[PDB]
Amino acid sequence: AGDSVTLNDVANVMYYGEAQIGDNKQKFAFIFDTGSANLWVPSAQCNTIGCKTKNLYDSNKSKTYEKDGTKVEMNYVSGTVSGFFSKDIVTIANLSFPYKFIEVTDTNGFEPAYTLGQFDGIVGLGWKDLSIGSVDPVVVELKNQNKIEQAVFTFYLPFDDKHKGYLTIGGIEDRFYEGQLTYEKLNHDLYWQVDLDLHFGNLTVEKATAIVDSGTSSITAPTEFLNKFFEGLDVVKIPFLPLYITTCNNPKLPTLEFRSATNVYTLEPEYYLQQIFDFGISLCMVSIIPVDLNKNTFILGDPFMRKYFTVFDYDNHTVGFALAKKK
Amino acid sequence: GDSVTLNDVANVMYYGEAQIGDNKQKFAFIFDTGSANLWVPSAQCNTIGCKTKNLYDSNKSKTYEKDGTKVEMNYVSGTVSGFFSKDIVTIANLSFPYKFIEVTDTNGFEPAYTLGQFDGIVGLGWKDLSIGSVDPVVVELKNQNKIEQAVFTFYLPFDDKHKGYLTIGGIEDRFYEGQLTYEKLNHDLYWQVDLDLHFGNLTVEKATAIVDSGTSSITAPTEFLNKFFEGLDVVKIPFLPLYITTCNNPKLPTLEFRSATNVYTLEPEYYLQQIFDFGISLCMVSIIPVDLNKNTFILGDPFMRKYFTVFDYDNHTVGFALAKKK
Amino acid sequence: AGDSVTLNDVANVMYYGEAQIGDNKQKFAFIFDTGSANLWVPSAQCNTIGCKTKNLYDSNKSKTYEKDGTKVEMNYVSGTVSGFFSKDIVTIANLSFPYKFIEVTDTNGFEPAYTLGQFDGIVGLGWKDLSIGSVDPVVVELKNQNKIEQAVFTFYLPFDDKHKGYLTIGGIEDRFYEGQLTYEKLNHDLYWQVDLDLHFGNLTVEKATAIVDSGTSSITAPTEFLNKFFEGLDVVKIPFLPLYITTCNNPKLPTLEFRSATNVYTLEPEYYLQQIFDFGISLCMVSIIPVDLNKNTFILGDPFMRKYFTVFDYDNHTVGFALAKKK
Amino acid sequence: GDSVTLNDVANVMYYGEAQIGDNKQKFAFIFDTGSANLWVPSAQCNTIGCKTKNLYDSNKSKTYEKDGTKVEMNYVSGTVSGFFSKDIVTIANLSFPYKFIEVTDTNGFEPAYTLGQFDGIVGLGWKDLSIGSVDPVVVELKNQNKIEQAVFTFYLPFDDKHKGYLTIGGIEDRFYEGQLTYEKLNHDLYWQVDLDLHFGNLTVEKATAIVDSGTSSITAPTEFLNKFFEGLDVVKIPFLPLYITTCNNPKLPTLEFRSATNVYTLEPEYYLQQIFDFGISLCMVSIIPVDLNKNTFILGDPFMRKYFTVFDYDNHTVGFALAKKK
Numbered sequence A, C: 001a002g003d004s005v006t007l008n009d010v011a012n013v014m015y016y017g018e019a020q021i022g023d024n025k026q027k028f029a030f031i032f033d034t035g036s037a038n039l040w041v042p043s044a045q046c047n048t049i050g051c052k053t054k055n056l057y058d059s060n061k062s063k064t065y066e067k068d069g070t071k072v073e074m075n076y077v078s079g080t081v082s083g084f085f086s087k088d089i090v091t092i093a094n095l096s097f098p099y100k101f102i103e104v105t106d107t108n109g110f111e112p113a114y115t116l117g118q119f120d121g122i123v124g125l126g127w128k129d130l131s132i133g134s135v136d137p138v139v140v141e142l143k144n145q146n147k148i149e150q151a152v153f154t155f156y157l158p159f160d161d162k163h164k165g166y167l168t169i170g171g172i173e174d175r176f177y178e179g180q181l182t183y184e185k186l187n188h189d190l191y192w193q194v195d196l197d198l199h200f201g202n203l204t205v206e207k208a209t210a211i212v213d214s215g216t217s218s219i220t221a222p223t224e225f226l227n228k229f230f231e232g233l234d235v236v237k238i239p240f241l242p243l244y245i246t247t248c249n250n251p252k253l254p255t256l257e258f259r260s261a262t263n264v265y266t267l268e269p270e271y272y273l274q275q276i277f278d279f280g281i282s283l284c285m286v287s288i289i290p291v292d293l294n295k296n297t298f299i300l301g302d303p304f305m306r307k308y309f310t311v312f313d314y315d316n317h318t319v320g321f322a323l324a325k326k327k
Numbered sequence B, D: 001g002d003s004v005t006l007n008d009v010a011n012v013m014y015y016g017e018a019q020i021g022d023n024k025q026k027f028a029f030i031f032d033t034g035s036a037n038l039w040v041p042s043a044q045c046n047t048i049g050c051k052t053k054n055l056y057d058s059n060k061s062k063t064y065e066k067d068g069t070k071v072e073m074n075y076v077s078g079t080v081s082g083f084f085s086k087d088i089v090t091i092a093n094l095s096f097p098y099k100f101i102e103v104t105d106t107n108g109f110e111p112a113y114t115l116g117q118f119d120g121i122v123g124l125g126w127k128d129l130s131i132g133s134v135d136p137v138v139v140e141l142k143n144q145n146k147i148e149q150a151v152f153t154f155y156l157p158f159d160d161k162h163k164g165y166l167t168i169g170g171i172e173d174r175f176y177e178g179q180l181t182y183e184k185l186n187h188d189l190y191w192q193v194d195l196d197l198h199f200g201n202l203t204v205e206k207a208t209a210i211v212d213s214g215t216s217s218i219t220a221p222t223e224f225l226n227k228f229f230e231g232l233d234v235v236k237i238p239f240l241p242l243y244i245t246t247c248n249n250p251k252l253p254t255l256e257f258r259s260a261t262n263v264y265t266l267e268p269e270y271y272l273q274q275i276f277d278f279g280i281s282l283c284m285v286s287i288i289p290v291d292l293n294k295n296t297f298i299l300g301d302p303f304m305r306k307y308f309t310v311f312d313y314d315n316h317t318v319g320f321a322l323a324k325k326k
């Protein structure tokens, strides 16, 4: 079946698509993040520098807005936003549903990541307990009022700007993938964390939790593991920055291997590399960066999701994977 | 129809393999609607440029029919040397007697040749354009009741590591979309057409425009061009026929090709090539200064990436559509 | 008069010189940082990855070492080092003097900034009260025992990479500059913070504290001030990093103007730019980055110090400036 | 001596100004020890490449002595057209009657000409090289008891500002250091010299090697070179005479140039130019395939940047030192 917000892609490094808010259907661009669980927009109320270029929600000219007013920090690792809670009717796709969200009023905690973004707010797409305010996930809310067949959603991401990407709600559309799905059951309903013995060419790590995260531009690994990784594969790290450079055909670059009970998952380097220079010799950025999180915890972010169509299934506690169609 | 699977190389030249000989020696070929002769490095080609190449040995094929006349191939991008021969040429699964040049002296055509990953060229041009009046391979195939139409299609892939097609005998549905305007040759020489050539301000009315798959690039009059880029933000890198600009450059116009029937247009997204993308992103521009007879334009590869091309010996036309973008 | 450690320069991006520790004169490379105030070396004792290629100080085979052993974090904004205090006699230039320093034993908090460097430790060259342990500044220490004429030091940093930099202790040598010195009284003896109305093309900020900092590769500005700056001068910021790219002759680039009661100090853009691409069009990195610190606080780091010879004067509480010679 | 201050442009070509006429029209010039004719865009040059250029108006100078014979300049990098003339040329503060080409048709020499920021070239080659046998400008100055020596020096800067020097009349101390080996011309044609040419393994004994300030680069036979770079890590960018490598590339040798007296050598640090430096540093390499008579090599700008050059009509010699590095 399925209902689909098409997602525009900027420098392969973030994705955004429209959604509406209020019964006067005020428009907004959002990052759909399977690694966070709240929704927010700039508030008509906000007076910080960053807000001033964005589309500002007016709680006023929506007739279906209801007041709440409880104040909230929202602390991503990328920065902080702050506002208060409101209730209104959010439309995603053209599915409509009441929701609790944040009218953000302070953003200085999140700029320039925000002053230089082309998105008004974020839409959380993880699980209920990653939420600030125990708010049900929007796909879940939709199910809970017969708006959707199944409380499942999918990500299809592509390979640059006027190539179009697609978040689909409540249906698993064949148009996106090839082969069959392979599923992995989650190990907490928090992030879409599943459970994996990872193998990066030379070192492996036993049963790691892998976060599948639409929100991250990059693949991440804990920092011990990475230094352990890059040594000897002629990758030069620009100094003082999470930034790794190598020749595009550096033939010492291992295919990454994600392996589970059911299945095997792989990432050729053509997937975790960015072309940066291409003039007889081609130079590349390696799209893997240090990040320390609870367990052995790796985020497969955007590079992984480019190879793999992904089905997130609230009903079963699973994420499915198939090869994404190139066309 | 029937297509030869085209190989991309830096989007700067494409090649395909085609067999010569009953013994069926396979070769790497550039298919060049800009010339009308076929050739290969003879096994008796003694020039070191020849040494990595695929040779044709007139021994191995039974069908080898001796000729021997000597011959000069004078491409503006260099010259080759040898003598004529005959044998059974095959293109995809299309076999036929043809006369061609056995190439023995590759020296006046390197470095060009010694780098290139191609052994010879095939002319997809006209009988008029041939050195030796060899009938174009398609027109032969026709008058041997071997395919429906003295026609071919050029489907070139927009992008580097993807396939590309020389279809023969009939237009295919897959390859294109929308309709298919035609225009007619103003000479049965090159696949040259008569064209109202608009380009920002600068028109140059009733130009001759050569369609040509051999050319990696688009060309213009050295004077009309130099005058064009002026005031845009396109820097020219000194004594090389090369120009860099930023890819977002908003001074950059679309290019117009209107006729009596219709209009065609080249978006800057079709005549730029990336070189560098990191924060700012620069692209090199695929239009180059080269002078000939009229206002004579070469629409090369950048144009054919946009427009599927049909080459019609029968109806004296060339015809175009939006290349199926994939 | 003066004595001088000659400083080697890597990618215009950090500078290091040799010095000795112990009475068996064990050698080490150090960053001389006028923006922190402690000395440390890797300890013979250190077993973290980042130590493993460095020259480790053996408290043992110095016959003049005295134990202390009190343990210390040292928390730069670039990272953390950890170890304990020892006393030994440190020689810089070839001036010899007793000191309290840090035997660093844990570095995992500072790597790869330390795994990818070619320097063993750091030498703090700031003021007493920036020191962990109220330790007198080395140059001060040296005065306090008749090793030097006057408790003053100088930084001469070279243009481009080769050609050699120098720190000069206890003498102002005419070989390094031209014109005359213009001095500025400090506004706390903490950093070499002086007091400045800064003027960058279009935006000015009234009476800013400027930190003169040999250690920093770049110029820094508070984040609001920067976003406010770069707008409209076609400077693209690489996404998700403190990285600013532009065309080298972007003729919108303002000369920076630092202006005080006595004096005017200036920085043409040929000083705050790093090339990156020279093919016809020509690309440049802008060596200014957002950094938020107490007041309106700017660090004039390595770019400034390339135009300007600098005299740090403990005796007067001043920093003096003259044009560095090009030869 | 007496020097003309040379201007640098992308280290790809240098230029200087020198005056022609009694009225003293100043001009931008390339000083090319690779040709021996002087020329300027006549005020009667009607070609649109002429329009930003500095023209010579044979009206303004009294001293204009009419000639008019028509003439073709056929550089290998293009051709120019005009008729001859005569007047008082000045080079720095050196004035003298000289016969030259008034250039009227620059079309066979663009885009080259219309971008270049230079109006004419001056030849600093020999009489035998001259089209019309005009005696070289230095040998004239000489034989008008106007300077001590039919000699000149070429001093060449490294960076973009930093300026260059064509000195005339005598070698200067400032410009160089150490000694000064000489070698003797194997023809009084180009300043060509006989050289045992060593380069990694590949020698090519007793080659002829042209010193030439006009050339931006160093050149070699297309075959010897192609074979050279093989197994280096030097990628060639497709059908442009252009090669990229990483600047630290350790497979890159120093070049050798030995004779009977002495040996000269080109460090990679002299024949590379940064294209890209960030994390990895890439450099484009200044050596290019071009074929002539013997093993004939053009030592151009990369070589003259290392070595100061002394050009000796009198003692038939060319001589070199380490260019005073500043």
Ligand SMILES: Cc1cccc(C)c1OCC(=O)N[C@@H](Cc1ccccc1)[C@H](O)C(=O)N1CSC(C)(C)[C@H]1C(=O)N[C@H]1c2ccccc2C[C@H]1O
Pocket: A013, A031, A033, A034, A035, A036, A037, A075, A076, A077, A078, A122, A130, A131, A213, A214, A215, A216, A217, A218, A220, A289, A291, A293, A299, C240
């Ligand atoms: C929900 C919650 C509640 C309380 C506390 C915490 C810590 C919580 O988690 C939040 C979180 O930070 N969530 C992150 C996921 C996350 C968690 C922990 C560490 C790192 C990431 C969210 O999914 C996400 O992608 N994001 C978030 S913002 C973003 C959309 C820009 C994106 C991101 O950072 N994108 C940037 C990013 C992220 C990682 C690496 C590289 C890059 C570049 C760019 O791609």
Ligand SMILES: Cc1cccc(C)c1OCC(=O)N[C@@H](Cc1ccccc1)[C@H](O)C(=O)N1CSC(C)(C)[C@H]1C(=O)N[C@H]1c2ccccc2C[C@H]1O
Pocket: B012, B013, B030, B032, B033, B034, B035, B036, B073, B074, B075, B076, B077, B121, B129, B130, B131, B212, B213, B214, B215, B216, B217, B219, B290, B292, D239
């Ligand atoms: C003139 C003539 C008269 C009677 C008979 C004959 C056979 C004649 O020769 C026609 C001719 O030479 N034809 C050329 C085409 C041509 C026609 C008119 C003017 C100039 C060229 C031949 O077809 C062809 O494309 N080529 C040739 S080789 C090639 C496949 C590499 C390609 C080419 O140059 N490719 C290169 C090229 C060419 C031009 C611009 C850019 C680039 C980049 C590169 O990819």
Ligand SMILES: Cc1cccc(C)c1OCC(=O)N[C@@H](Cc1ccccc1)[C@H](O)C(=O)N1CSC(C)(C)[C@H]1C(=O)N[C@H]1c2ccccc2C[C@H]1O
Pocket: A240, C013, C031, C033, C034, C035, C036, C037, C075, C076, C077, C078, C122, C130, C132, C213, C214, C215, C216, C217, C218, C220, C291, C293
């Ligand atoms: C010692 C101390 C004790 C108590 C409290 C404080 C705040 C202390 O000082 C912290 C500090 O980090 N001090 C920094 C200075 C500083 C002060 C405030 C904020 C940030 C830095 C020390 O001077 C220093 O240069 N450094 C430090 S490491 C280094 C010498 C390589 C250099 C640096 O990082 N350089 C990196 C840097 C720093 C800023 C901008 C760009 C870059 C690129 C790179 O060069």
Ligand SMILES: Cc1cccc(C)c1OCC(=O)N[C@@H](Cc1ccccc1)[C@H](O)C(=O)N1CSC(C)(C)[C@H]1C(=O)N[C@H]1c2ccccc2C[C@H]1O
Pocket: B239, D012, D013, D030, D032, D033, D034, D035, D036, D037, D074, D075, D076, D077, D121, D129, D130, D131, D212, D213, D214, D215, D216, D217, D219, D290, D292
């Ligand atoms: C004068 C004369 C009279 C009768 C006969 C002959 C054969 C004559 O000489 C021809 C000649 O061209 N002479 C050339 C040298 C030459 C000789 C043989 C083959 C090729 C060149 C003259 O010196 C010269 O450099 N030049 C000349 S124009 C120029 C100043 C741009 C420069 C040049 O080409 N510059 C370009 C160039 C040249 C070679 C390689 C790379 C580049 C890049 C660019 O910098």
